[PDB]
Every structure is written in C-alpha cells, then in structure tokens.
Amino acid sequence: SFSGYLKLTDNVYIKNADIVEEAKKVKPTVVVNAANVYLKHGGGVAGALNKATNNAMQVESDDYIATNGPLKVGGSCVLSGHNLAKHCLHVVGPNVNKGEDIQLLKSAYENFNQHEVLLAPLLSAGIFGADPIHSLRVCVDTVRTNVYLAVFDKNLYDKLVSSFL
C-alpha cells in the first residue's frame, strides 16, 4: 500500500512526493487530478499526470467533454487512470486566479467521499491560486474516506505539517 506518509487525522495522510511518481509506484485504485472544467490538462498536476499517460488522459478527456460538456467548478468525473491508477477522479477545485468562489473548495473535496481510498493533491493549491494551508484544512474537515495527499514542494510540505492544527 502507501508508504512514508505522515498521519494527520484518522483518515488523512500526507507525504512530500511527486504525485506522478507516487501513482506509478503505488498504482492506486484512484488518483485524483486537479482538473479544470474543460479537462484541459495543460499544467500543474493535470499537465504532469497527462504527460505521464503519453497524452492518453487528454485524448480520453476530449472525448468525455465532446459527449458531456464541461464539468461544474466543485464537480468531478471518473475516467481511466491509464498507467497511473485504476481510475482518475478529475476534480475541479475553484481557481482563485480565475475569480472562482473559494467556498466551492468544500464541494470539490466532497467528491472524494465517493471513493474508499484515494491518492490526491491539495485541491485549488499551486497554479489554482488558493492557500494550501486552507486547502488542507478543508480536506481534513470534509473528506471522511482515506486520502493520501502528495505535496510536491518540500518547503510547502514542511509548512503544512508544522502548522497543522
């Protein structure tokens, strides 16, 4: 299973890791993608996960969007995990840099409750512009299923652990 995680709560675990390398190592049932409503996996975690799939995630995502239209901010869809996981849960956290309502972060994390165990990044963190300390707080207060958080940045990981209440 998952190794080297620090236990934050009964169900939330955290590690300083590259989520792509973590997904390849573990091949979890579910890897969470920090998706946008269009499933355009250009950068951040989405760009990295997509590049690891040799663009198969993007090809599948474009077919999903062509059939279903865009996701809602706070929403999700389950697609293939390709070479990274059984499934990829594409979750759309609010993008603060696009003026999206930060209150939608709790709705975004609620999607995780539909899966018993997940490998995930902090939603709305990084290029999505939200405070990662706030994202971790919303995660612990919303997610009830087992969530293994991968935080790429060592300095951010240390700040998250040392400030965790």
UniProtKB/Swiss-Prot annotation:
Activity regulation behaviour: Inhibited in vitro by GRL-0617.
Catalytic activity: Thiol-dependent hydrolysis of ester, thioester, amide, peptide and isopeptide bonds formed by the C-terminal Gly of ubiquitin (a 76-residue protein attached to proteins as an intracellular targeting signal)
Protein location: Host endoplasmic reticulum membrane
Origin superkingdom: Viruses
Function description: Responsible for the cleavages located at the N-terminus of the replicase polyprotein. Participates together with nsp4 in the assembly of virally-induced cytoplasmic double-membrane vesicles necessary for viral replication. Antagonizes innate immune induction of type I interferon by blocking the phosphorylation, dimerization and subsequent nuclear translocation of host IRF3. Also prevents host NF-kappa-B signaling. In addition, PL-PRO possesses a deubiquitinating/deISGylating activity and processes both 'Lys-48'- and 'Lys-63'-linked polyubiquitin chains from cellular substrates.
Domain Macro stretches: 1-165
Name of the protein described by the UniProt record: Papain-like protease nsp3
Record membrane topology: Multi-pass membrane protein
